[PDB]
């Protein structure tokens, strides 16, 4: 048994609480409300530093203590089973961070969940669709602390269970090939994946295992305490439930109230008749559409398409082409049902329909890092400037900067290589794309001279205009995707500027021996 | 005049609204509340795609319409004044997204702002402080549309103003060397920066110019409608204001509150006596502490210290050393006041004191990509595993993996290279750091084998056990840093798995011809 002091957010909200005048005076004499917490310490619920207790459970404990005029105390127990006994004594009035599988005890009763929480199914980036076959033949990794061994076994009997000390270890397994699937807590998964594993795994569906959200547990006879705690929790508005979830960085898990878009008669029967949708993408349009060292589809678009898959349940199959002219070709003929990423273009709006854009970004001209390179975009007079053939930018550019000499290339990658080779003085790119390339691969060879005085580029999904049922389905889904998820996705694709030259250097010395 | 459909978003809130009942049935008879919005379209407040209207303003219109039992309609007008003309006309009941410089118009009445927004000053990432002498002689970039020229000139009279078509072009100007300082509103600035400009610039302080938040405008004549709207707007809790801010990806702007940490007198005078604090960091500890191509301090930690400055007003001076021994050497000797990033360590807690961790990450083993390489950490029997000399990790590892043969190196970069060279069969790393190096610089040479069944590593600030006021201040600051901002920093530092072997390939082919 260890005592801790509760820090849980600076400004704790006031909820409208309605209690029996007899309930209030009971609380008044009780003085101290004691929460008990336990062994592993599983973020974001439980976070321990020094003598201080904090976390999502801490925060609701804070909300309960504050709105009931109570002094909060915290004791921390070496194991979950010792904590359960601490409740019985009852040395402590509340136990923290318990779900549906701990009461499930009958010795203990659960408060209304203070945190919405359900189990989710995680698979590697490549994996397509849920094994709706109830994960048969799969190696299913789980936190030993999350679900009871036989809840899984009953729900996934043809799956091979493999238990790990922690949620992270289970998830690591799926990332690094020791397991095929992960089942885990939605909140903690969201944390783990967003922080640093989003390249390795993805949340693919909810699991058909019922757990309660996260709750406080109160000893079974203590029917009065359950009343007054629930009095508070029920009064917490959803805005506060949400606000706290964003703060612990679990913004990715809001979406996990999963199926959300309401679909038409005409739309969902289309979805039955077209379970697989064919997407055309550019092979070298980084960081928007690309293929990794894995031969795997990747980039901002690949990330968004994956979410669209979560929202619609469609299975996207990706077809990669080298040039833009080819991409449109496959779109017209129906070889491809949709474009993964196209700049919104009024010219092609003749025959194409664009989704709600999911990237809006400004443009820049990239030059070599020679003394002779155009110093900035206002000094483009008589210099050769690379653009992609038939770009919406091309008319606009020679309108704004007429002394600039436009030369065209087939795809965005060749346009940039022209500048790297000496065949051009500048190339027009989105800031995201240019920023990316310059610091990542061309440190000390290329540079962003300046912005262009053009309107911002918009990147979207595209279909042929006839494709009406698809586009309304995509747009419905795209609307369900918040700009926070898009920003999280984009910024983590742009990344940060490190020191690739020191490490090009190390890879090169090693190659000599 | 074109009408738009307010896109039905998420879960629109119920606020506790109090109205007269002469008011309530007046609303019942009225049926429809009509919002007017106008051509320019200002993300994230006003966004148009086709016939659909969305944005921060859209969301609050919804809250007002919903909580007052109204069907909301939106008409979109080609010029601001055409909307103004519709307002007097009574075609529209309220006009959207008007702020403090339009309640300097007095011709219409403004609701209490539904979204707080203030101007901020943006400078290049390297900057320390706003330039002295009210930005005199500096090149100040602003959106032509943000502030009225005479407002800037009154406040920054000695400054060279440079106006731009857009907020992004202004910010682009500071990023790419054409301007020195940027001014714009916290909400749209936070989006631009957090989305893709965080490598190039930073928000440094608020600008001493008052603008109102964003408000609705209603006909001056219509005092009844002003009452009922404000009835709703006032009742929207701070959680809901925040949640919407988070959803639109502007979580970064809550940090521009600005200051929240309350400091003691003993502390406030310590900060006085030591305005400059010297931080020791490892030179090649990516993505935590490193020096990038600029010879500039970079990594997760630098971002975090950047935040620590903003929260405390200390000036951090960065001292880069090559090894851990060397680092601690400077920490004991007093050359350095604190460590930028150290693993939390039970051994050193005798003479070292650790901060609240700001990275918590589980550990992994990296092996070469030979068939000989260990398959996972359970198959390390008789294999050599590189760790850093006197690392807290070593004991824990040989306790768990007793047949494993530890070999040590001076720093983390050297420890990893041991595996690259052939001097070790595997190396111990944080999963983040390993993930980074492997996919970024060592594609097809190194790989992550599996997680380790050890506790997660914790990265923290460190001082000598004596430096108490320093540590106390750092911890106060670190608690004020939301777990959401830390997550945003870590993900953009891990970044994403691309195709480095392609661009190694293009770069060498360019130099060969």
Numbering used by the authors:
A (entry chain B), B (entry chain A): 33 to 545
Copy text from the publication.
The periplasmic domain of BvgS (residues Ala29-Leu544, which includes VFT1 and VFT2) was produced in Escherichia coli and crystallized as a recombinant protein with a 60-residue-long GB1 domain at the N terminus and a 6-His tag at the C terminus. The structure was solved to a resolution of 3.1 Å. BvgS forms intricate butterfly-shaped dimers in which the A and B polypeptide chains (‘protomers’) wind around each other, with an extensive dimeric interface of ≈ 4000 Å2. VFT1 and VFT2 adopt typical Venus flytrap architectures consisting of two α/β subdomains called lobes 1 and 2 (hereafter L1 and L2) separated by a cleft. The hinge is formed of anti-parallel β strands in VFT2 and flexible loops in VFT1. The two VFT1s are open, while atypically the VFT2s are closed with no ligand in their inter-lobe cavities, consistent with the structure of VFT2 alone. The VFT1 cavities are each oriented toward the hinge of the VFT2 domain of the other protomer, and the cavities of the VFT2s are each oriented toward the H19 helix of the opposite protomer. The VFT1L1s interact with each other through several hydrogen bonds between their H8s, while the VFT2s are not directly interconnected. Both lobes of the VFT1s, VFT1L1 and VFT1L2, contact the hinge and lobes of VFT2 of the opposite protomer, forming the largest dimeric interfaces. In particular, both the Ct loop and the N terminus of H19 strongly interact with VFT2L2 of the opposite protomer through hydrogen bonds and through π-stacking interactions that involve a conserved residue in the BvgS family, Trp535. Thus, the kinase-on state of BvgS depends on tight connections between the periplasmic domains and the transmembrane H19 helices.
